[model samples]
Target chain A: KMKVEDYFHDILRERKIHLTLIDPEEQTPEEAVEIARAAIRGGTDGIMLGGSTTDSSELDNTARALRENIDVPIILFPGNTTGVSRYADAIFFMSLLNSTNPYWIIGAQALGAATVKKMGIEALPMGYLVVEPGGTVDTKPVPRNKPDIAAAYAMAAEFLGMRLFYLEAGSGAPEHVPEEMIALVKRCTDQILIVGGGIRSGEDAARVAGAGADVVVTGTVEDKIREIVEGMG
Target chain B: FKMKVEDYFHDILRERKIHLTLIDPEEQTPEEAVEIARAAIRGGTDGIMLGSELDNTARALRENIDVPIILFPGNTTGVSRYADAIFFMSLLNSTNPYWIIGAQALGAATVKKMGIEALPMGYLVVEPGGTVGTKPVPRNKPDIAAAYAMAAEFLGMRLFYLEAGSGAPEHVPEEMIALVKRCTDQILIVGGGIRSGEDAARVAGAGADVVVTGEDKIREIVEGMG
Candidate 1:
């Protein structure tokens, strides 16, 4: 099992900021080049390519374009099987523990395994969870399949033999995963705990990191990367 | 004419001299809807959208409200004939056909058969992480950003809604909004994940057509703005 602590410790030791690159789904390679440059200039540790609905050619072109301009680790945060590219530093092999959907678990993995091995991208097998946000805003479809049980969540991570456990509230979710839930999961799993989504400021990330998260990931707060990274530091 | 649900719209519209539409989901009871509607009209609201998540109360409120009640369906059962228009929503991010087309399939023809106008809305859920409703969106395995765009475009969606579902972990990323806007080139509605004006401006700059914020902060923020 890969440990998120390794990434955290490495970032701390090297004094290198761990930044993730985000390319909007709309931009062309030409447009993304400028955006990627700005993100790198703003101090991203690395870049993550691919978005909710990007074409394979766009993914490749954007990844190549970003790599051309910025000298940073370009990684792939693929939304589905279609988002793979050779330009990435590594891929976060995510398994949704919260989902009853098999495609997200072993099914997607089976499909990606051959290509991942052939491409030789560092595979970071992760345990993913989608907890409920507090208020009524946008309704999503993923949580409908989840059974209510922390033990089940813990067991899912344990059963899958995953290296990292990511407790997510979904992109644009209303609330962060509960501190208690993180604490509880931490108690059960020795795997690296990565908590992300719904984190707004550096303080939020700090709180989760302080609580016991081996790695804290915030996607939307990337524009305020300097503040968040400095705060985490 | 119906009343606006938001209080901030009154002064902004008054100052700007624009007619603002208020969608009142809170007033679900017949008496309550009528009372709120009358009050809104008295206050000079242009029209009303009777939106509600609660089906039972919605039925009664729609019956009593005199203004045009636009159905804001939180679920399939929340639809009603008494309303003026429907924000026909399709959850763009989910591969779940039910949210994308199931709701529409269930009511689109029926609403048309009844001569009701449907405002086809491509609903995107964004989150920050809180007690907000969108926290329940599928997490472990979710659709990629590309998938979201393809679904909306494939369906020939007219409006794109980029939401940071209530209690969002953070405001919908401007990058995300920019992506959706770039892809769809349609009316972009952004909500949730907004804490202040700076956030609002960022999303607006990123190309969102309309930005919505809930709670009392709407007034405070709208008031403080130049």
Candidate 2:
């Protein structure tokens, strides 16, 4: 099997990849499997599983089930230290760059690093940016639509040796990250850029893709997988 | 002006000190906790350390006792403004970074915002079984434990706690305590597996600045300190 890093690099070379984000809280393991199967069938390049406050046991069961049935990479987007599972191909070992709380910045990372290392899970160092009109975990959200400001933060993350950037508007924002904001962040760093939250249509996904996002994630709109994938083209 | 928490260490070391008992809320009743606090105070314990129920117990102890009420927090949820000071600790010997830095990060902002005096402590668990979820330093490897202590001091930690873990078969080896004492100027705290005054005396004789024990041994340990 190709390493997750190599697979990411390879897929980006072909075209932008579509990732289906599955929150365990939103579905049972059976429902997740069904949706995952359909999403993959509808052309999602991979599956990203996790949530803001999910039961650890459910996540493990869901990830294990998905791994058994899916041939594509199953990556973990952990919300906290307890969100780790040995079954996944890799984890987005992320730090919320704009959190006023240091715990989310380096504390949570430090807490989970040993566990991830012990589990022998591949860790993708990711810089997580929560744009405005979204609720950040345990604190206030960063101001919205300041593309240059967001880009500066991304530049700092790149210097800190992060290889991936996740620009999130949260789970259900009223608006996706503006195309200009996405483009500025892309221009600032060569890292893999993943844009998600409040992306309701294939057209929205395409706009993010057009804005230079290497991967566009859709969670709530999994039912529209075909249209979203088509819109990506 | 009130004396800072760091200053208390200097005073305690100048004179023999006993940190009454660690009152684990999970293990004792409210009445039992009050009785223990009163006993330790009557026995001339220098301070009281509460491990849980920060607001309730610390307030109760404060209303009845005149000594400093210190917080020996188990995790981030352990902080309370009711306590006089907190042992802002990081379990240095844990292989998991979350225990070392994660919990601290979660609590740092709150600790600061509360204006609580935080005595930064480097906590190292030694011997057969450390606390649950914490990685233990090798029993015979005092040198390795001392290295961790030195690194912690270099990182600006003000205190070093060499723990043998609660309910261990034996306390931290005196040789290990002596070795850690030699490594840094940080005030040294030794706890766990200390069942009597003799056990407390042995570690204190080995140069431990403060000895922490449960209520079961507080009277004996305080008497032994004399």
Candidate 3:
């Protein structure tokens, strides 16, 4: 009877949780299951399926594969509306709050709104804020050391009523969003703060947790992610 | 290329005696576990042994300290992937094999899969024993304890822990401690009612490699280990 958002709130009520993000395009459904099972064993609280270039089929196959294999919720983390999977328990229904283009922000979301509503997948509305090395997204990367600005952006998203916020540092960035930034964001926003990208180790994850994030996401590809959530402990 | 927590443990034992603080997160919140761990570290505890609600407690302590955190599970209930290492323990004298081979068999894969180092140890519940499996724990005599320790060594265990089950009126006997150490190569650990620096000193003097205590007043116990 519990919705995915209810699961999120319940788990986050007491402590930070680790969400493992798996990109289906980077690996086959079989390989993704291998990683997801391992990640859950290493204490990942949920599974996020998607990549920057995943297609509907890849998302569907991997999402269904993951849902079958892991007890945790499978949250579809689409790069664009093209990646939605009805097999997923939910989607991040995310808006890149810092994106320079409306199409990458809310324009595409408008087009997919009806489809998502009819798919029966629970939508957990989230705001994504990109930082340095903003991948290929048409977004201005927020500079490091600007906790005040990051917190302000998060506060605005919360006021606009999103219940979840993510701070991203782009894949493979040399550094993650500053822990100081997470602290400020947590202090100001009532949202469930999720921090991701460039987290190199479990020790790095612990610092982000210490900074007050409610959920920590990692896609560090495998094994190392074990060390990361092992740090989350 | 990095030293595992098991290696760190053996290295420390080779150099001198060690004190491991046991924090039971059973009735306490994670915040309380952190505070207790902080106090233990400040008291010079060489390592921390987690009791229960293990993941939450370990996560809380990880943010506050750099000391090695080891799992000391009461049974098969909580195996924290966050721990630096696990005792990979088997309660040797339990009335049921469930506390012996069964729990370990079930947990070995998770521990192996999580890449947690398994410091295989034989757990022997001593005098005025408490419950673990089917009945009250056994309170072994020195010779009986030695039999278990000798058998543990024969079974390939690297460590042996002699525990006086929860709230026992006293600790394991020094005679038993000395006998077990003399009987096997397994690095010996003693816990329960080692309440003071004097008790710590006695256990250390009895040839135990490590002294563990759950007492909140750990400063004196740690000092006694010295």
Candidate 4:
């Protein structure tokens, strides 16, 4: 059996992968299962379970449901310490790179480390960079559309030993990460790159992929997963 | 010259003095609190630490006593400008970052805005649990707790608070207090589980700069230190 990290590397070599993010706060456990199943059928490569400020009980229910219903990997994109679910195959043990608050950078991770280690969860160290027009947490994100600034952050993240880079424009933003910025960050590190937020259409997904995004994540536009996958091809 | 809160605290330590009595607002009414403060002061207590409703309680105590009224805030929400100073504590043993740095981040700005003196403190819970819901960092591991205090000192924190938790089954070990004192030059405060004057003096004699306790034995602890 291929290790999950090796499997992702293999998928990236073939083509860009589409990740479906299911926010438990926005759907019931049953509804989450239905969407995850459809997303898998629509050619999504993986399922990400969680959201900022999601209830622990809801996240647990959704992760268990998705794990039971889907054949793809169930990854926890935790927002805080309470977002752990033993049912998931792995967790994106992430740090917010641009957060002015140190708690988001390393403090939260320290608190969750013991729990993750004890549970035997596969931890994927990720650097989470939110772009301008910040959503949900209302952050003052890294300056928007500046490829140089984003690249510097990506380089620093790589130096810090993060295996993945997640550049977010926030959920429901009017615009996604600029294609130019994606390409610039791609040049800065060999780490797996994931771009998400405001990617609402197949054209948008294809554009980011063309600019070197290894994985394009979608949540609100998951209904058009098939169209996006086809467009990426 | 008028002494700053830190200077006053340091002066007391230099004189081998002990400050006793921690008044928790959740445990007492305004009238009862004022009475306790007056009694503690009359009994030679050097200072009073307010644990909640900081603004109202500090003001009330200030009007009745001449001693320093320090704010031992439970969270950022407990900060008040009326107090002489605040602990600005980071719960070093907490499994949740919210207790370690999250509350401190939010509280730092507020303390600066209010012009209150902030004493950065590394707060470690020894054993047993009560009101403050932080994860305990193993009771017998004095070395681990000492290392945390030293780290806080290196990070520019000026004080170390070794708490056994309010209503704890036992006080922080005197050996743990001695170990932390040996490891750092930061002011050491020991609180909770101190049931008698003998226990208070025992910890103070072990190099604790301050001994905090509930109002129940404040007078006895103060006298015992003398």
Candidate 5:
């Protein structure tokens, strides 16, 4: 029953920290629950669940397991519509602001919003920006609008009034959000900034955080959670 | 015998009107790449795509493959003079500028100075669950069709690449590729998530200049070709 707007407002105003949960496709729901518990024990403020490929049942089951294991809010970071789980505390409603793609910008939102509302899940409107990691990574399908870093910043600024700015590379990406882009986005947008993808080390984490990321996420780094968590903190 | 695998692939695919195949020589050792290039030439394929995200796979592939190995650099380290060309991709979907223009600014001058053929490619995604394996690059998911059409004109990119994240649920929607082609005359290159010959024919009919499929499916591809 909590308003998604209120949740985001609190995050931005209070500077709340959130931890990302990336599930491997092979792991069962029971395994994922234990992993969620471990992440909570490691000082994660929130648990994000989902992988690059996930089914609706996987998400639903994972959400249920996380609910049983952790007392913290469980947020859904989906790769598709199936990423929707009513058990989560919140969902990031992402719109690729830089892309000419209507699906990412509005079409997807239209499809997901009703579902979120029907499920009574809090929907946090997020303006997603993908920074090229100097390689041919897989984000091409989503936006196809290869906006320069500055353009991403400018777009984020334009949407700051209504959406949170999420700067990411695609999953298992080889690159991190560049510091220049991060600083530029920070300079322009006052919205809560979420940066992830290709953050392989703590130094990388610290760099993004220092540049002005409100939330630093590492999905693959979960395999090295202890080290990554220590480094981020 | 003299032609390298990458160039050989390009020649055969060009003859066949296939434009989207990548020649990744990075999967093998330089010695292996060299041997494979010769074998690939005999087998017939399109241009060779090389480079791992963080390694010097491009240069190594070029050194060994004797083919026109294009550097598909994941990071900057993937670039080299040894390679025949580069697909200058911009992570236009992300808020990161470096992938869009930063790398371009830094590498463009060198490419121009070096006379390295630059193929401007707009890399877009059709990731359904947002969990795409080709996640090493930071990009925001976009609408595949719109992004392709925009890149066809806006970036002046000759090729509009519709990628279903590597091993994606399905190839970039055939409908999306068809839709983008309705507007632009630009060459369309579709790759990733292509698992079968039926999928290949679908994209080709959708009007793709090239249909790229990678890894374990090579044998299946050869059988399909036969």
Candidate 6:
């Protein structure tokens, strides 16, 4: 009965929620379903379907498996336009807000919009920002030393009406976004803050959430799942 | 003044490189295509090149925006009778004589009677091409492409279109673009694998007179075509 946006906001009203990401390459449909089921069982609030230029058919296989077997929203986190899957409940209609290439910032959004329309998926408008060693679809990563720069970009994202904001420490980033940066971004933007990278343990998740991140994803590392989600609370 | 579509191309090229948004009606319904085209024109595409399923798309678009609607058709059947002009083109290097010459011969009379303007274009489908009837000779073969560009110029075509096909994995070589520029005086319309503002900027810098793209990101692409 509730829209996906409503669901996102509703849960966040209570506490920071945990979202699980499923990368659909090399893993069997059975294996992915198990991951989705186990994460959901541990109270992962939703499933994020993402991967490296994984073929569309591969994307759908994991997406459909999650859809058929689980009871949470499936959000697509794609590297490019090819990630649309018909089974997805929603996709992050995101742009690399800081990519030097306008294509990543908006051109891909234009192409991706057409595909999203065809697939009939709900697109959640998100602004994706990069921190060092992380990337786009990006030009220069926001400096770690300048929390003000991160805040400025967040302010602009809010003005642009982007529904969600992510300050990514690239995949396998050696360090997480600093608490001051997260706190600063939160102070400026009312948009939902979904933060991740270098978050390896429950302590890491707790620290990020304490700094004002609304949702937590522990990618490249998971498994203290219950501990992680509890800390996220 | 209401310049003919050809004059519009000339005038725009005189001042700056232009962007054309290619809308394939098959990619979406006519009405949907109209919205994307409308958005592109609103964002500043110099012209709208509507291909394949014509009339309905053009029909919806004509009322929606005021710009030249150039018909890019495969044959007479795909040509719209009321478009501002049609790319009266022949693929200069297709092994199939029909794609190169016969099809053009068959379509010329109907195009004449259709009351649309015609811009004669010498088209070359670079490696990794469009349509099955024509095959691309290879990947990264620019000089071979240069030979074709020179031939088209000698044969008196004023416009040269170098296409690598839609959503191409890699674009037409900049080497080919520069070589084509050196050998021919034809206006170069470069397209394919152009998905970024950076992509458009690089092609524009490489001497492309017009940058072409599919149904999105008109603003980024257009801004990059300095």
Write down the C-alpha DockQ for each prediction: 0.01, 0.02, 0.01, 0.02, 0.01, 0.02
Model 4 pairs whose backbones collide: none
Q: Relative to the unseen true structure, what is the C-alpha lDDT of residue B170 in candidate 2, on a scale of 0 to 100?
A: 86
Candidate 3 ranges with C-alpha deviation above 4 Å: A220-223, B1-226
Q: lDDT per residue, candidate 3, A1-233, as tens digits?
A: 25887888787767778998878778889888888888877778888887576457877888887778778888877787787877888878776766655555444554465566567777776778888765555777778876656665564444334568889887677777888788877876578888888777888888888888788888836577678877877
Q: Candidate 2, after superposition: displacement of residue B58 in Å?
A: 54
The residue ranges of model 1 lying beyond 4 angstroms of the native Cα positions read A1-9, A12-18, A30-34, A40-43, A134-148, A220-223, B1-226
Off by over 4 Å in 6: A135-137, A220-223, B1-226
DockQ of 6: 0.02
How well does candidate 2 match the true structure in TM-score terms?
Answer: 0.53
Order of quality (TM-score): 4, 2, 6, 3, 5, 1
Query: fnat, candidate 1?
Result: 0.00
TM-score for each predicted model, relative to the true structure: 0.44, 0.53, 0.50, 0.53, 0.46, 0.51
Q: What is each candidate's fraction of native interface contacts (fnat)? A: 0.00, 0.00, 0.00, 0.00, 0.00, 0.00
lDDT of 4 by residue, B131-211 (tens): 773667677877677766654553345778998888887788888999889877788999888878887788877888888
- Runs in model 5 with CA error above 4 Å? A1-16, A134-160, A220-223, B1-226
Residue B126 lDDT, candidate 2, scale 0-100: 83
Candidate 6: TM-score? 0.51
The deviation in Å at residue B50 for candidate 3 is 60
Cα RMSD for predicted model 1: 21.1
Report the Cα lDDT for candidate 2.
0.75
What would the per-residue lDDT of candidate 2 be over residues A1-233, giving only the tens digit for each residue?
Answer: 45787888998886888888887877888888888999988888889988666568888888888989989888888788778887789888776766666566555654555466567577786878888876444544657656766776565455334678988888788888888889988876788999988787888988988999998888846459888888877
Task: Put down candidate 1 lDDT per residue, B1-226, tens digits, no spaces.
Answer: 2443233233443453222134445544555544555565554333455443344444554555454555555555656655555666655444444453344444544454454555546675654334323223332222333245433432234555666665575666767767666655455666666657676567667766556554334343333232
**Backbone clashes in model 4:** 0
Q: Could you give candidate 6's per-residue lDDT for residues B204-223 as a string of tens digits?
A: 88888888898547888888
